[PDB]
């Protein structure tokens, strides 16, 4: 098998196991119109202290920075990985991103955050985030399979599996602790599950590429993956600092969120056979174990 | 205002009305696992005469010739029509085609038609159908916007709005008259509604292209569209002859199916401002009015 080459017959599948990702998204499928956000609008308006409102506002803006955008990467994977089973997953994933866009676009509207969203791009922390996101996808349109592989790798391991996860954690933790933001936490939980599925497929694709082209993955390029991992963590850790610019939440300190992120980065590296990059404080990490127990 | 030109900023939308197509497919969304085909399997095995079974088998094979294939045209429209609103529709449509593929692939399996499906491509009537289908999409990957426009036009007006519709009509008519093939007619009705939506969006895209580039739609190019309309009808009319090779169904004669097809071809031409091509026998057309009353 060669993942990069087109095949003559539709059947049999060369990577039949990838078909499970279509079933996974059909099971996770959701539209924001299934949730009721009336209490969330009221909570955001009058139920929060100024510290809590600033944290929630910034978290919603940070999710939207990624979700409220044109996201065609998954829908285009078939051009460079021309397999029917990959094209099926890619199309299923591309549609799920349209559902995410509509959900967060609706949430910015009803929370009265459209003007703040338009001005978000001017923030240095956001520009720094955009830099690592654009660098990660610099080869998304490359004619070289090895360069394109770098884009899949960084996109799946770090963007899909980690970029939004401090934000998903903040919303879920807020609902778990305060029983507020019911509709938003439902939408966030549904988005988390789909991003987890997106990254898992990308991890599987990378392991197929690595199995078929082991010589592309030397100690040298493994060091290049590790420095991109560090850049992603530093940028996301700074986004966390900005989210809590008006004060930390006592039940979810930044130190707890940072350990949660480092662990996700480690798991992404380990998923493709690399060694872990971050030393983990187990006691601080334990505080967020409930998140993965919910997402699965 | 140019449909072919990239707009990086998400809002304001240039064609906000195209968003209705994403909501239309979310409303029509279905998976074959929502239907029960147990009675259909039994009907196909023991409930049909030799004439009826041959007609149903050939109809299912003809639907599958189009549906059981990699269908990435809709998911790629954004490359040449780089608008966020178009990209959202394209991704939603590309996913619906994966659902259609899984549905008809499941139906070929449970009806024991996998081997007959593998050999279908060798039939002269099928080769003749493939010829007009491939000719219609010959410019699907062109760098010239005018040539690409020809592919969208033929694909939407004739392939999406008509190619499968004699088959959808045959299945629904069989269920209406005989109260058999319950699950299959449900899946066919659900597919018909989504193909109707697919072609409607394509018609809207063509009318935007025609509004922005009226000089592209000259008498010479309109004559080519009419010549392609005739080629599509002749090939689909021959597919109908093949479906009924073992005998016609008294309740749905070929003359009735052919008038149904000619009328659909006329409506596609009229939808983009071209004149009707076929003379219609109104009495024979009236016999299939119930079909559009169900789909629309
Ligand atoms: Mn998303
Ligand atoms: Mn994703
Ligand atoms: Mn279809
Ligand atoms: Mn279609």
Numbering used by the authors:
A (entry chain B), B (entry chain A): 104 to 399
Which text from the study accompanies this structure?
Ribonucleotide reductase (RNR) is the only enzyme capable of de novo synthesis of deoxyribonucleotides (dNTPs). Class I RNRs consist of a substrate-binding component (NrdA or α) and a radical-generating component (NrdB or β). Conversely, class Id RNRs from Facklamia ignava, Leeuwenhoekiella blandensis and Flavobacterium johnsoniae are all proposed to function without an organic radical, and instead utilize a mixed valent Mn2(IV,III) metal centre. Here, we crystallized and solved the structures of an N-terminally truncated form of LbNrdB lacking the ATP-cone domain, LbNrdBΔ99, in two forms: apo and aerobically Mn2+ loaded.
